[PDB]
Structure formats: C-alpha cells, structure tokens
Coordinates of C-alpha atoms in Angstrom, one line a residue:
Chain A
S1 CA -19.3 4.6 -16.3
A2 CA -16.7 4.2 -18.1
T3 CA -13.9 5.1 -14.8
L4 CA -15.7 3.9 -12.1
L5 CA -14.4 0.6 -10.5
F6 CA -15.7 -2.3 -10.6
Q7 CA -18.3 -1.8 -7.1
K8 CA -20.6 -4.7 -6.4
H9 CA -24.2 -4.7 -4.6
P10 CA -25.9 -6.9 -1.8
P11 CA -27.0 -9.9 -2.3
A12 CA -30.3 -11.2 -1.8
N13 CA -31.5 -14.7 -1.9
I14 CA -35.0 -15.8 -2.4
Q15 CA -35.9 -19.6 -1.9
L16 CA -39.4 -20.7 -2.6
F17 CA -41.1 -24.3 -1.9
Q18 CA -44.1 -25.8 -0.6
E19 CA -44.8 -26.9 2.8
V20 CA -45.0 -30.4 3.8
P21 CA -49.0 -31.4 4.2
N22 CA -50.6 -29.8 7.3
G23 CA -50.4 -32.6 9.4
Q24 CA -48.0 -35.3 8.3
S25 CA -46.0 -36.9 10.9
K26 CA -42.5 -35.3 12.2
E27 CA -41.2 -38.8 11.4
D28 CA -41.9 -38.4 7.8
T29 CA -39.4 -36.8 6.2
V30 CA -40.5 -37.1 3.0
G31 CA -41.2 -33.9 1.4
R32 CA -38.9 -32.1 3.8
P33 CA -35.8 -29.5 3.7
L34 CA -33.3 -32.6 5.6
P35 CA -30.0 -31.6 5.4
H36 CA -27.1 -34.2 3.3
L37 CA -26.7 -36.7 6.3
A38 CA -22.8 -36.3 5.6
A39 CA -22.9 -33.2 5.9
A40 CA -21.9 -33.0 9.6
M41 CA -18.9 -35.2 8.7
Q42 CA -17.8 -32.7 5.6
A43 CA -17.9 -29.7 7.4
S44 CA -15.7 -31.8 10.2
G45 CA -13.4 -33.7 7.4
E46 CA -14.4 -36.7 9.4
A47 CA -15.7 -38.1 6.0
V48 CA -13.8 -39.9 4.2
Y49 CA -12.8 -40.0 0.4
Chain B
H1 CA -9.4 -76.6 22.1
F2 CA -6.3 -76.6 20.9
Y3 CA -7.0 -74.4 17.6
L4 CA -4.1 -74.4 15.4
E5 CA -5.1 -70.8 15.2
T6 CA -5.5 -69.3 18.1
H7 CA -8.6 -66.7 19.0
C8 CA -8.2 -63.4 17.1
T9 CA -9.5 -59.8 15.9
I10 CA -8.3 -56.6 13.7
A11 CA -11.0 -53.8 14.1
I12 CA -10.7 -50.8 11.6
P13 CA -12.7 -47.3 13.4
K14 CA -14.2 -45.5 10.5
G15 CA -14.5 -42.3 12.1
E16 CA -17.6 -42.1 10.7
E17 CA -21.2 -42.6 12.5
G18 CA -19.0 -44.6 14.4
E19 CA -19.0 -47.3 12.2
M20 CA -16.3 -50.0 12.4
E21 CA -15.4 -53.0 10.6
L22 CA -13.7 -56.3 12.3
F23 CA -12.1 -58.7 10.8
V24 CA -12.3 -61.9 13.3
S25 CA -11.9 -65.8 13.9
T26 CA -14.9 -66.3 15.1
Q27 CA -18.2 -68.6 14.6
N28 CA -20.0 -66.4 15.3
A29 CA -20.3 -62.8 13.4
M30 CA -23.8 -61.9 14.4
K31 CA -22.8 -62.0 18.6
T32 CA -19.5 -60.2 18.0
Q33 CA -21.7 -57.5 15.6
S34 CA -24.3 -56.9 18.2
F35 CA -21.4 -57.3 21.8
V36 CA -19.2 -54.8 20.1
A37 CA -22.7 -52.1 19.2
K38 CA -23.6 -52.2 23.2
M39 CA -19.9 -52.4 24.8
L40 CA -19.6 -49.0 22.2
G41 CA -23.3 -47.4 22.3
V42 CA -24.0 -47.8 19.1
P43 CA -26.3 -49.3 16.6
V44 CA -26.0 -52.7 15.4
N45 CA -25.6 -51.4 11.8
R46 CA -22.8 -49.4 12.6
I47 CA -20.6 -52.5 13.0
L48 CA -19.6 -54.6 10.6
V49 CA -17.9 -58.0 10.6
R50 CA -16.5 -60.1 8.5
Chain C
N1 CA -29.1 1.1 -22.2
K2 CA -29.2 4.7 -23.3
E3 CA -27.8 6.5 -20.5
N4 CA -24.6 4.3 -20.9
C5 CA -22.2 4.4 -23.1
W6 CA -19.5 1.8 -22.3
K7 CA -21.6 -0.2 -20.2
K8 CA -24.7 -1.9 -21.4
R9 CA -27.4 -4.8 -20.1
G10 CA -29.0 -7.3 -21.4
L11 CA -32.0 -9.2 -20.4
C12 CA -32.9 -13.1 -21.0
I13 CA -35.6 -15.3 -20.1
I14 CA -35.2 -19.4 -21.6
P15 CA -37.6 -22.5 -20.9
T16 CA -36.0 -26.2 -21.3
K17 CA -37.2 -29.6 -21.0
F18 CA -34.8 -32.4 -20.6
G19 CA -35.7 -36.4 -21.0
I20 CA -35.4 -38.5 -17.2
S21 CA -34.3 -42.1 -18.0
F22 CA -31.3 -44.1 -19.3
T23 CA -32.5 -43.9 -23.8
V24 CA -30.9 -47.7 -23.7
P25 CA -33.7 -49.5 -21.8
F26 CA -31.9 -52.1 -20.2
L27 CA -30.3 -49.8 -17.8
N28 CA -33.3 -49.2 -16.3
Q29 CA -33.8 -51.7 -13.8
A30 CA -32.2 -50.9 -9.6
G31 CA -31.6 -52.9 -7.3
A32 CA -31.2 -53.0 -3.3
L33 CA -30.4 -54.7 0.1
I34 CA -32.5 -54.6 3.1
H35 CA -31.6 -56.1 6.2
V36 CA -32.9 -55.4 9.6
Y37 CA -30.9 -56.4 12.7
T38 CA -32.2 -57.2 16.0
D39 CA -31.8 -54.4 18.0
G40 CA -34.4 -52.9 15.3
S41 CA -31.9 -50.9 13.5
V42 CA -31.9 -51.1 9.7
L43 CA -29.2 -51.4 7.0
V44 CA -29.8 -50.5 3.6
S45 CA -28.2 -51.4 0.2
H46 CA -29.2 -50.3 -3.2
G47 CA -26.6 -49.8 -6.7
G48 CA -26.9 -45.8 -6.3
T49 CA -23.7 -43.9 -5.1

C-alpha cells in the first residue's frame, strides 16, 4: 500500500429525517424540506449582494 | 396646479422576485404601489414606494 | 492496521452539547413588523439577517 497512488472510492450519502404528520396540510410547510427561498436566484446570478 | 416641481418618478428594478423600489413625487404612495403592481402583474408586497 | 505497515486507519465517536442563547440576557430579544396589503399579500420584516 505504500506504492499505491491515491485511489478514490465511490461516494455514499444517506440523510434520514422525520416525515411530517400524515394529514398535515400541504400549505403548512413547517417540518417539510422546503429549499432556501432565494436558491433559484442564487443559482441564476440574479440574487443581489 | 402649477406646482413648481412637476410630476417625477424614478424606478429601480432589483432583478429579484419582481421587486421594484420607486422614488415618486406623489401624495398617494399606496395607489402608486398598487397601480405599479397591477401593471407588472406582481403582488403588492414586491413594490416599494418612497 | 495489522495488515498495513505504512498506512493506518483510525476511528472515533464523539458527542457534543451546545448551550442556546446569548449569555448576556439583554441580547435575547427580537422584533418583527408585518404589513398585509390590500391584495392580501404579506410583507414581513424582522431583526434577523
């Protein structure tokens, strides 16, 4: 192993979290994985810094 | 009326979510705000009149 | 580690606890300002950035 060149292994990612109550209203986003509200504009370069 | 300062408006488009900030010579910021929002087709909370 | 002389692996599991709040009491205050315009759209403003 002292003669082996850096070898990268396949990445594995698992995220576990809790689902919101079964009958929770679709309009109630508390507890849901809602993306950052400005993410799309940040990805487009429209977000102003 | 002959107000010494005639009608004037400066409109600044932010480029985000339809946001716009306007500097206006008006006695009615509320109507200015709603009328601009109506013409643009965006919610009133996106328009700022000063 | 028994089979490798010039490369070694390590493992460690650690816990953590972090106190929540400013330790100076007076900074633990927050304000918000909300307007509902006539079309029903809501503009929220708060002290956070």
